[PDB]
């Protein structure tokens, strides 16, 4: 089966690391960080890695049950939540994954809504409130089946009831919020296990190419973004096709459908990420109707035209 990419413009793509549309393509060659995100990880022959799963609704989502309110002398109210797999089955900490699939893969205060529907009734009671999950906290231990969240609400969260976290953005990106999209949480609070590998360009003159989404903020100053290696639709497509990879690197072209011309070339690496020959940083300015097309299988020594 020949390898293919879906025919989708940037305006038809969504982020695989947070539920956001893709806004711009982006490079940052001067970034020295180790890029080792765990969501949006899929090999070109369709094998999911890290905490990656297929549902757009599952990215940075949690499902579980609140056990109790937890003492915290900080402003705000804190709650302990058992987390399950997104399908509601109990999470097995001995499973060879880093954390339940869909778990956030970066350090920060993730802002969203906690909602509950009671199991007992002949209609059940419901409640929903804004909440924040600090993924850098020693209490963030999803690999152990347990996390904490904080609310502005002081009382109206029920113990022992089915609970859903719907992610919306970040609570803050100030100095104390520890937002760093390339810093992994400590999923067991202990060393992380079964991680998708870190990625980097191998050939001189290349940099990683990202799909960038700007992520909403509850308050404060900033223009934070989340960069993913491939959009969620690529994860989904690669998974469906399961095409054998014929080399370590696919050559792909970003093409303008109107003119049929190649805007630029990129390497699509077997592990599932893009590199380009670009020495500048920042958003990539390219036509909105453009998309990536598979050209051929090449190798690590193949030289890209500069963009």
């Amino acid at each position, epitope marked *: 089966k020949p390898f293919t990419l879906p025919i989708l413009t940037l305006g038809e793509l969504t982020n695989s690391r947070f539920p956001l549309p893709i806004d711009v393509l982006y490079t940052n*060659p001067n*970034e*020295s*960080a*180790i890029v*080792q995100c765990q969501n949006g990880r899929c090999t070109l022959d369709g094998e999911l890695q890290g905490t990656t799963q297929l549902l757009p609704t599952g990215i940075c989502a949690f499902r579980g049950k609140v056990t109790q309110q937890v003492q915290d002398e900080h402003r705000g109210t804190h709650w302990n939540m058992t987390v399950t797999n997104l399908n509601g089955t109990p999470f097995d900490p001995t499973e060879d994954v880093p954390a339940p699939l869909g778990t956030p893969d970066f350090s920060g205060q993730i802002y969203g809504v906690i909602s509950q529907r009671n199991t007992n009734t002949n209609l059940p009671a419901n409640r929903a409130h804004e909440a924040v999950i600090a993924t850098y906290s020693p209490k963030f231990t999803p690999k152990l089946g347990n996390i904490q969240f904080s609310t502005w609400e002081t009382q109206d969260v029920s113990s022992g009831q089915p609970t859903k976290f719907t992610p919306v953005g970040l609570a803050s990106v100030d100095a104390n919020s520890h937002f760093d999209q390339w810093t992994l949480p400590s999923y067991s609070g202990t060393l992380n296990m079964n*991680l998708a*590998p*870190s*990625v*980097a*360009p*191998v*050939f*001189p*003159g*290349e*940099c*990683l190419l990202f799909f960038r989404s700007f992520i909403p903020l509850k308050g404060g100053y900033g223009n934070p973004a989340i960069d993913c290696l491939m959009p969620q639709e690529w994860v989904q497509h690669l998974y469906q096709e399961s095409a054998p990879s014929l080399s*370590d690197v696919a050559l792909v072209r970003y093409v303008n459908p109107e003119t049929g011309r190649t805007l630029f070339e990129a390497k699509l*690496h077997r*592990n599932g990420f893009l590199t380009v020959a670009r020495n500048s940083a920042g958003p990539v300015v390219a036509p909105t109707n453009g998309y990536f097309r598979f050209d051929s299988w090449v*190798n*690590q*020594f193949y030289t890209l035209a500069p963009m």
Partner: nanobody
Framework: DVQLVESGGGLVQPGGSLRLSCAAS????????MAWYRQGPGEQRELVAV???????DYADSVKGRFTISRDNAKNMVYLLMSNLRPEDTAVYYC???????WGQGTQVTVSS
């Protein structure tokens, strides 16, 4: 953000062999790739050899069949075994997980009579 250090360079006669060593501050099996590079005097750094986690390898045309890249099964290290060394192989050699990571010292290899 990974620290690297290479060693094992030296002076070798043409047709000779050298084994270079590279250690990293994080698990080499956590990287998608490990690679060896070289830089001749007045030259740019060029890719020499690369290996994936499972052990898949590739080489520059000029060293293919003479060089082997491998990993240490007991330690956190990668190697470049170089055979039939030629004067034109003279260069400073570097290991890296990728080109966006700050470079180590490098180890000088000189192939001379």
């Amino acid at each position: 953000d990974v620290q690297l250090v290479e060693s094992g360079g030296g002076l070798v006669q043409p047709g000779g062999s050298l084994r270079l060593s590279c250690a990293a501050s994080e698990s080499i099996l956590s990287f998608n790739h490990m690679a060896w590079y070289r830089q001749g005097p007045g030259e740019q750094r060029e890719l020499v050899a690369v290996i994936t986690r499972e052990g898949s390898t590739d080489y520059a045309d000029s060293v293919k069949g003479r060089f082997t890249i491998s990993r240490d099964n007991a330690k956190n290290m990668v190697y470049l075994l170089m055979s039939n060394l030629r004067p034109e192989d003279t260069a400073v050699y570097y290991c890296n997980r990728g080109i966006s990571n700050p470079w180590g010292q490098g180890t000088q290899v000189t192939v001379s009579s």
